[PDB]
Design an enzyme around this catalytic site. Structure first.
Site, mmCIF file in Angstrom:
data_model
loop_
_atom_site.group_PDB
_atom_site.id
_atom_site.type_symbol
_atom_site.label_atom_id
_atom_site.label_comp_id
_atom_site.label_asym_id
_atom_site.label_seq_id
_atom_site.Cartn_x
_atom_site.Cartn_y
_atom_site.Cartn_z
ATOM 1 C CB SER A 124 -0.988 0.007 1.207
ATOM 2 O OG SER A 124 -1.377 -1.306 1.583
ATOM 3 C CB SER A 149 1.840 -4.890 2.567
ATOM 4 O OG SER A 149 0.796 -4.086 3.074
ATOM 5 C CD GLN A 150 -4.325 -2.945 -1.178
ATOM 6 O OE1 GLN A 150 -5.437 -2.983 -1.699
ATOM 7 N NE2 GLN A 150 -3.741 -1.800 -0.783
ATOM 8 C CG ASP A 173 3.826 -7.793 9.863
ATOM 9 O OD1 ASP A 173 2.803 -7.081 10.065
ATOM 10 O OD2 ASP A 173 4.325 -7.964 8.735
ATOM 11 C CG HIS A 211 3.784 -4.439 7.696
ATOM 12 N ND1 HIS A 211 3.308 -5.680 7.315
ATOM 13 C CD2 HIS A 211 3.313 -3.564 6.777
ATOM 14 C CE1 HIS A 211 2.590 -5.560 6.209
ATOM 15 N NE2 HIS A 211 2.586 -4.286 5.857
#
Length: 191
Positions: free
Chosen positions: A26, A103-104, A158, A171
């Site tokens: 993101s 991540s995303q 995380d 993260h």
């Protein structure tokens, strides 16, 4: 990174030894981002010199809001991922494909791979996920995809890995794993 279009601009007369499809995190710039994507591309290129590298761009603008949809991203995004996998199969059906996501982008890739069909899915030899936002929901894996072809990096502090959308320092810390251990994994999966 931060922009790579090797698959989109590559020609079917000159297929490479392998294809890497990557979805960024993101808010990251370009289509590869600047952390995990380039690190993974780099590490893999050190093992396999003739390689096409492809970021997932198009509608995937890596927005914060889309994280809150079911499955961890939008269907438009997932579909763009699916398109690229199909394009790889069209251009170079005999070339092995590996994939990565952060991540995303991990949510994106996991979803896209799960919806792939038969021959196109078989072409995807291996997938590496980092800071996987659906790790809890999908029980550490990708639906309808062999666990032995999957490798998930989810650092201990995380919080996204345990079903919460918040960002801790853990993260932000996958570049070594991406360059090293993850690249080796994907290389192995290509033989």
């Amino acid at each position: 990174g931060a922009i790579e279009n090797g698959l989109e601009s590559g020609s079917a007369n000159a297929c490479p030894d392998a294809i890497l499809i990557f979805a960024r995190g993101s808010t990251e710039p370009g289509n590869m981002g600047i952390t995990v994507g380039p690190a993974l591309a780099n590490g893999l290129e050190s093992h396999i010199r003739n390689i096409w590298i492809q970021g997932v761009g198009g509608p995937y603008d890596a927005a914060l809001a889309t994280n809150f949809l079911p499955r961890g991203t939008s269907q438009a995004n997932i579909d763009e991922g699916k398109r690229l996998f199909a394009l790889a199969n069209q251009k170079c059906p005999n070339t092995p494909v590996v994939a990565g996501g952060y991540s995303q982008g991990a949510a994106l890739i996991a979803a896209a791979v799960s919806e792939l069909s038969g021959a196109v899915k078989e072409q995807v030899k291996g997938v590496a996920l980092f800071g996987y936002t659906q790790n809890l929901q999908n029980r550490g894996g990708i639906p309808n995809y062999p666990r032995e072809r999957t490798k998930v990096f989810c650092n201990v502090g995380d919080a996204v890995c345990t079903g919460t959308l918040i960002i801790t320092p853990a993260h932000l810390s996958y570049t070594i794993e991406a360059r090293g251990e993850a690249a080796r994994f994907l290389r192995d999966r290509i033989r």
